């Protein structure tokens, strides 16, 4: 059918943080994206009677805002009435950050259609990069625009030689796509052995998704743990990733080719659930100490 | 890099007020946080010869005390040698109220290091809530703890129908974060037109950071003007914040749909400074009621200052 | 009329805030690129016979001006204890003078006294040289003050590459930069000068990226505020290429030559959207110099003995 963005009217648009965390100094509520918070998009809507099956409308999400959670959004996004009948079937496209909805025959069977929705949403981590920074969360529902600034904190700890986080959970296979940051403080080491141990997941050695990048600018370390890899220096082939424990352990000597190094690394990985969907533990063995970071998951 | 909190020794640890306001009645110096006073933390230190590049140590600030001024502290906190180079690179984290310092290779090229520092510090307003009250300003430098009682005054007039203050200055963009208190004495009104006029600043309507919180409990009205907003009832969506004068004036009818109110509000705002100003920066509030117009104004030095007085004719 | 003789300034003082100690002499100095400013203060009284529209001047000396690294505003006011303007001032950089004109305050009040404190600075173009004392002078009304102040800008003449903020523009907050290339007068076969901005952008259309060829070593003033009317402007002999959303500027200073012992003063204008990173890629090495403009809190120091 035809684009009926001008016939679908959204009001009381809101973006909330659930649950939200307090900044311990300033007392403002913030989006702590690695401490269980999500965003919630809400709105009321009315649909004009001139709407028919096959007509379409869009949700356009801005550069810092997207549907979904830590887990990437489904391509399927439906608009349901209060009893669970499908008013419209939608297709989310991550390339355009837009959902395109198509009305069902529901609108041909009912008039004066009015309701409301709630949707779990998140930061677009690639663009909303930096701790304690306010980002503009923007959506356009039909032709109705809304923007609100949200303060994000991912909890990067830049003084840590080793820190890791979930970049995203894959919606289709539930793989944990991980980011680890090695040597943010730019210390100098003669030993630098990087180990990941999985509980409840496995690596796939042949999937070619264990990537090692050599940081050339400190700002490539984005607090969001979703770096733009197309601009990083890919040095994966210069290292030997060694698997063991039935592909549940990967060990890498980051000192390879050197006796002393102040190099800094971003490492990305894919850990596939064994079956539910576990623990991922990292260690970095150095001259003086063994650093640890764990991420734990229900 | 192991933790060498036991290898870096601090001494002559002190906390003082700059400049402070002497109370003629007590003879005591007071920390008037909203009239230009800061706290200054100071210490001397030595570093043990076993310390190496990559080792760390912390400054752990206590519950009533933090680095910085009215302006929030930088994440970046460094210490310097006499030659001007950084000898320890620090990251301050507001969630732990702790700075973690990592030594450079300075400590590998030098021995018998002796040093000192002085830092601008401040009350942690969220906890050091109340006027004319003494709070324990505590810090731990390495493993050396020190504390000091400070008498804090923000100048909140709990009998004022309308009063405001700076809550904080954003380190990154210099935005002035304001707290305004409406109806602290729980009076009853039929008119409540709340106006803010900015001189030297602009609001950003697209941000929706003009927040209105309905007060249930009188104790939510902290004298610090740094309330815990998570604990308040956000009623912003129930009012219309109307912007005029290219975003220098904000108008909110706090009646929107009632003949009578004894509701109490905490209103928070973000004022972004324009490039420059020939005046003292200024935030002017009015509350227009049944009978009286109340008003409060906040003014900030141009940076320098001046004054004058004399006998008024008549 | 001119009431310089009816406005009486006393307790005049110029202080360094906060000041840095010279590492050898122990004297307090004004380290103009390490966050020091000068502070001018005085008390004053006004004769009862002064009226609205009467004027007086603050006449600043050849080495001294109001403002900080950020240029002073044309508008300079003096206030009373109520926060109202008692005198409206106009500062002129040409005459280095603020001319104040009393308001009707003085006609409504008598026995008036007051005081001011003013952020001030070296006039970099004249106070050119590191570890040099310059007389900081002002005449307030008819009351003169002069005090020698030792300045240091931290030029490092042995460095192939060094830069500093020349000034910040009061009206658009642009950071006006000066970079010195090849003060030591070495000979190079590669000389690629790159500038990368964080929190600022260049205006590639402004044509305010200016490249000057040095003809006399003294043109490299330690203050990074050279008199550009005396320099040789060679901007049109080079190609300034902008990239990265106007955050990066690249110039090949070897253009037209194979080997070069030329020396350059380069000036730039960076508009806030803070750090400015310079590199100079040469034959054997890549030099770098960075100016970081974060609010830095307080001070610290340390010393020790050398490893064996």
């Amino acid at each position: 059918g035809t684009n009926v963005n001008d016939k679908v009217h959204f009001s009381n648009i809101d973006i909330a943080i659930d649950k939200g965390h307090v900044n311990q100094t300033t007392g403002k509520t913030e989006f702590w994206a690695t401490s269980s918070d999500v965003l919630k998009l809400k709105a009321n809507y009315t649909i004009d009677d001139s709407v028919k099956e096959g007509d379409t409308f869009t949700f356009k999400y801005g550069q810092y805002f997207r549907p979904g959670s830590v887990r990437l959004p489904s391509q399927t996004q439906n608009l349901y009435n209060a009893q669970g009948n499908i008013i419209a079937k939608g297709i989310y496209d991550s390339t355009t950050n837009t959902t395109t909805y198509t009305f069902t025959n529901y609108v041909d069977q009912y008039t004066n259609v009015r309701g409301s929705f709630e949707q779990v949403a998140f930061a677009k981590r690639k663009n909303a990069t930096t701790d304690k920074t306010a980002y503009k969360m923007e959506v356009t529902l039909g032709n109705d625009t809304y923007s609100e600034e949200i303060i994000v904190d991912y909890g990067n700890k830049k003084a840590q030689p080793l820190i890791s986080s979930t970049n995203y959970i894959n919606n289709e296979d539930l793989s944990r796509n991980m980011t680890a940051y090695v040597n943010q403080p730019k210390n100098t080491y003669t030993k630098q052995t990087f180990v990941t141990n999985l509980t409840g997941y496995k690596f796939n050695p042949n999937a070619k998704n264990f990537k090692i990048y050599e940081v050339t600018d400190q700002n490539q370390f984005v607090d969001s743990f979703t770096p733009d890899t197309s601009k990083l220096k890919d040095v994966t082939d210069q290292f030997d990733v060694i698997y063991s424990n039935d592909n549940k352990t990967a060990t890498v000597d980051l000192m390879k080719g050197q006796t002393s190094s102040n190099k800094q690394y971003i490492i990305q990985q894919v850990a596939y659930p064994d079956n539910t969907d576990g623990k991922i533990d990292y260690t970095l063995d150095t001259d003086k100490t063994k650093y640890s970071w764990s991420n734990s998951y229900s």
Side-chain angles (χ1 to χ4, degrees), chain A residues 17-114:
Chain A
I17 312 174
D18 181 32
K19 160 183 206 263
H21 287 74
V22 201
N23 180 297
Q24 301 308 136
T25 292
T26 192
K28 290 188 192 179
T29 303
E30 311 177 328
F31 177 22
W32 289 18
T34 60
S35 302
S36 305
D37 287 334
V38 296
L39 309 174
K40 297 291 184 70
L41 169 72
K42 283 159 25 176
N44 296 326
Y45 62 88
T46 69
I47 293 156
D48 291 358
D49 284 345
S50 66
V51 149
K52 73 235 188 220
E53 167 160 28
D55 292 325
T56 65
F57 67 95
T58 57
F59 286 4
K60 299 191 222 298
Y61 294 87
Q63 71 174 318
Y64 303 110
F65 187 59
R66 64 156 170 86
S69 60
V70 176
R71 186 220 274 222
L72 301 184
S74 182
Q75 291 186 26
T76 301
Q77 303 289 338
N78 294 335
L79 190 75
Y80 311 106
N81 80 353
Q83 295 82 249
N85 314 134
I86 296 159
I87 300 174
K89 288 176 184 178
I91 299 313
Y92 174 74
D93 194 318
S94 52
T95 69
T96 59
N97 206 11
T98 303
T99 302
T100 300
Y101 290 91
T102 302
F103 288 108
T104 66
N105 66 8
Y106 188 90
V107 291
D108 292 326
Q109 288 174 220
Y110 305 99
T111 56
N112 212 16
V113 162
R114 295 183 73 85

Side-chain angles (χ1 to χ4, degrees), chain A residues 10 13 60 136-147:
Chain A
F10 294 84
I13 306 170
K60 299 191 222 298
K136 181 171 190 292
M137 303 300 184
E138 180 160 47
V139 76
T140 301
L141 312 169
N143 296 336
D144 296 306
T145 57
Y146 171 93
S147 69

Side-chain angles (χ1 to χ4, degrees), chain A residues 129-157:
Chain A
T129 54
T130 310
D131 292 348
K132 307 306 203 195
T133 301
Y135 293 104
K136 181 171 190 292
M137 303 300 184
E138 180 160 47
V139 76
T140 301
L141 312 169
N143 296 336
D144 296 306
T145 57
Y146 171 93
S147 69
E148 179 192 42
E149 87 164 7
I150 295 288
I151 293 165
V152 75
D153 192 357
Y154 300 92
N156 192 15
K157 300 269 192 137

Side-chain angles (χ1 to χ4, degrees), chain A residues 203-210 243 247 272:
Chain A
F203 289 121
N204 178 340
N206 289 320
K208 302 192 154 68
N209 55 22
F210 191 117
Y243 298 92
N247 293 322
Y272 303 92

